[PDB]
């Protein structure tokens with residue numbers, strides 16, 4: 001992937017993921033967009049055969065994932081932290097893509113995703129420079145965790161492609 | 165949803181979906197973006213408990229899905245048909261990216277039905293199926309690993325549809 005080096009500094013950080021299936025789906029979503037750098041903060045369960053199954057061809061993303069106890073560990077070294085949630089500085093996914101790719105050229109960037117039902121807590125959201133909301137149906141705005149990663153990752157790759 | 169009526173004309177058409185879980189996930193992806201009109205063309209098995217479970221709050225999109233025997237049935241009365249496929253040397257076809265597809269889809273759906281056609285897990289659409297489409301849409305991806313899960317591909321396409329709609333506001 002010609003995009004490999006441009007994107008490798010972008011950390012996808014999953015906070016306290018409940019289901020290993022979603023970790024797998026996340027690794028696939030990432031990998032399709034060229035993202036390789038997965039961080040799991042205190043997952044309920046560590047990745048297992050169901051995560052590997054759903055990762056399929058991207059099981060190497062799982063295999064290389066950093067698993068850490070605390071969010072601060074996953075954010076350590078990042079010049080840009082973006083949290084995703086359905087008063088703070090807001091980006092949309094397209095702007096998040098553009099900003100991430102530009103900052104990732106130089107330094108690590110963290111794109112932080114929350115728990116399947118709860119999302120990110122207030123204390124977690126206050127660690128981010130920006131928040132990203134994916135514009136959605138107000139009747140039903142909650143994407144599946146992996147689907148949300150796919151949207152963000154997709155806009156990251158579009159941003160990279162524009163630099164070409 | 166303020167988008168409801170502008171997006172109502174857009175049909176998501178899944179061809180021969182194998183796994184009921186994927187029908188549910190697609191229903192969820194669709195609903196979150198304001199799309200509600202799902203067509204299943206010869207599904208291997210009809211939506212069951214697993215579709216309903218993965219649909220979560222979107223089980224009404226499953227509930228209201230049109231199930232038909234032939235792709236032609238799902239395209240009948242559509243002025244624009246877009247199918248998901250990579251660029252092909254074998255069968256060259258005019259290509260959109262998801263962004264252009266959203267823009268074309270929303271412009272067209274303000275007036276007439278539009279069909280966004282997705283293929284089988286793993287293998288996609290046949291050439292005969294692909295020749296019923298005005299355009300093909302290719303999601304640009306990692307050359308080492310360029311196939312999205314069915315429901316993920318729907319999520320991206322639907323996302324670009326809603327972004328196109330949002331542009332109009």
Ligand SMILES: Nc1ncnc2c1ncn2[C@@H]1O[C@H](CSCC[C@H](N)C(=O)O)[C@@H](O)[C@H]1O
Pocket residue numbers: 084085086112113114115116117118119120132133134135136141142143144145148
């Ligand atoms: N509309 C949306 N915009 C941004 N992120 C979303 C989203 N829907 C889901 N997510 C991501 O998916 C995770 C699980 S959904 C958690 C509940 C709620 N939808 C929320 O966003 O807080 C979220 O923490 C977030 O990282």
Ligand SMILES: Nc1ncnc2c1ncn2[C@@H]1O[C@H](CSCC[C@H](N)C(=O)O)[C@@H](O)[C@H]1O
Pocket residue numbers: 248249250281282283284285286287288289301302303304305310311312313314315317318
């Ligand atoms: N990179 C991509 N671009 C467009 N659609 C894709 C895609 N990856 C997966 N899909 C969708 O998910 C379904 C199962 S995956 C099969 C991929 C298909 N053979 C192709 O070339 O596009 C496909 O039929 C398609 O609807």
